[PDB]
């Protein structure tokens, strides 16, 4: 109503509070909030004034509320609020305002920082992190829950990534947050840690030093897959680093935890579990043995033969990377073969894409080199593993890869057939 606008611009205190309340009410409906209409009335800048220092606290809370919902619309709608210079004021309210007020301010900031990597960075560059970390020294769960969510948006982003010198500062707080009883809070704290982990060795070392990984592992066995998903994503990001950084996670008992995740009813979880395992079998000889002793190979082989493609794909890597450490420990290869990975491996060539064919041929090749080195020692007439591959129908399929358009593949194929099947 136009009457509302008139009021909002009145010099009369009381009439202004009445208008901000009415305006905030229609942006809080249960249905489609008339955001554009409100913006069109040209009142946004007027609501931004009510968040200033001298303004009555009620008028500040109300105004911020309406403004937070206007900022929950499209990027176009969020820009109207950001272009009105509301951000710097939301930040001062985190310091001066009451708890109800802070609640509103951190919420508004959540929507702005969630619009784009630009706004995410803008909020960070307005130095919002200082006061935000202070919100966590309170006891009220609701406020801490919104601040945790907002913190999540600030850390999210890997295209232009957030300023590491700023976001890295939230680690200590996060470290505590992952022991919360509140599921919503708990969930968002994990996603935040996973965002800070998708970075360089420097970032991985920070998470490691604030002693997060051990807890992160205990969280893999939570009963809500809402906690399991972000926790697994961070754990997996860690084993991306060097051997030493990866040992910290093996030592935290992550392997026994992964054995369970392979049975997860959730498909994307089985996948990432294999992904993680594969970055650990990409490490040294000892780490490969650790995986073998944890008893992960058998279930891996099962998924290798019956999972969805996007999951088999990962199982393949895990098993293939393991075969590497076969040069050093010939038994690893023997174990792998004894567990029956040959047949499922050969069959994958038939439906795999070029990159997975290379990984499969490298594995089959390593498996073949060892079985050959044994023909020597044990003085065998034939290459045991070679005969195994012919059975599974592997030989025919390897032979077909000679007509693959990719040089790396057909060249690899001829060499295998020549060297081991003539």
């Amino acid at each position: 109503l136009p009457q509302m606008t008139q009021q909002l611009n009145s010099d009369d205190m009381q009439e202004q509070l009445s208008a901000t309340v009415k305006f905030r009410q229609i942006l809080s409906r249960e249905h489609r909030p008339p955001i554009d209409v409100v913006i069109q009335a040209g009142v946004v800048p007027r609501l931004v004034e009510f968040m200033r220092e001298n303004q009555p606290e009620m008028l500040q809370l109300e105004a911020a509320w309406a403004l937070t919902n206007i900022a929950s619309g499209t990027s176009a709608q969020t820009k109207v609020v950001v272009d009105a210079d509301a951000v710097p004021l939301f930040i001062q309210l985190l310091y001066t305002g009451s708890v109800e007020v802070k609640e509103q301010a951190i919420w508004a900031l959540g929507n702005v920082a969630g619009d784009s990597t630009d706004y995410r960075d803008y909020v960070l560059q307005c130095n919002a992190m200082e006061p935000i970390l202070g919100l966590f020294n309170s006891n009220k769960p609701s406020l801490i829950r919104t601040a945790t969510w907002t913190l999540s948006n600030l850390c999210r982003g890997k295209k232009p990534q957030p300023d590491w010198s700023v976001v890295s500062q939230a680690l200590p707080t996060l470290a505590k947050l992952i022991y919360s009883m509140d599921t919503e809070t708990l969930v968002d704290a994990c996603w935040a840690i996973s965002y800070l982990s998708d970075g360089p060795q420097e970032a991985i070392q920070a998470v490691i030093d604030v002693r997060i990984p051990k807890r992160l592992v205990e969280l893999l066995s939570h009963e809500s897959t809402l906690v399991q998903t972000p926790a697994l994503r961070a754990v997996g990001n860690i084993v991306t680093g060097n051997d030493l950084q990866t040992q910290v996670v093996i030592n935290a008992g992550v392997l026994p935890a992964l054995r369970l995740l392979l049975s997860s009813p959730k498909e994307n979880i089985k996948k990432e579990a294999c992904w993680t395992i594969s970055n650990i079998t990409a490490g040294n000889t000892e780490q490969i043995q650790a995986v073998i002793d944890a008893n992960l190979i058998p279930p891996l082989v099962k998924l290798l033969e019956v999972a969805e493609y996007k999951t088999k794909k990962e199982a393949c890597w895990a098993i293939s990377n393991a075969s590497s450490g076969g040069l050093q420990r010939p038994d690893i290869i023997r174990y792998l073969v004894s567990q029956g990975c040959i047949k499922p491996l050969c069959d994958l060539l038939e439906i795999a894409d070029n990159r997975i064919i290379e990984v499969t041929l490298d594995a089959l090749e390593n498996i073949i080199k060892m079985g050959e080195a044994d023909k020597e020692a044990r003085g065998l007439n034939i290459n045991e593993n070679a005969d195994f591959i012919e059975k599974a129908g592997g030989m025919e399929k390897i032979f077909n890869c000679q007509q693959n358009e990719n040089d790396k593949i057909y060249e690899k194929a001829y060499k295998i057939i020549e060297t081991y099947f003539g």
Binding site: N237, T240, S278, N279, A282
Partner: peptide, 5 residues
Amino acid sequence: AKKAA
């Protein structure tokens, strides 16, 4: 052989 994403 370390894969990131």
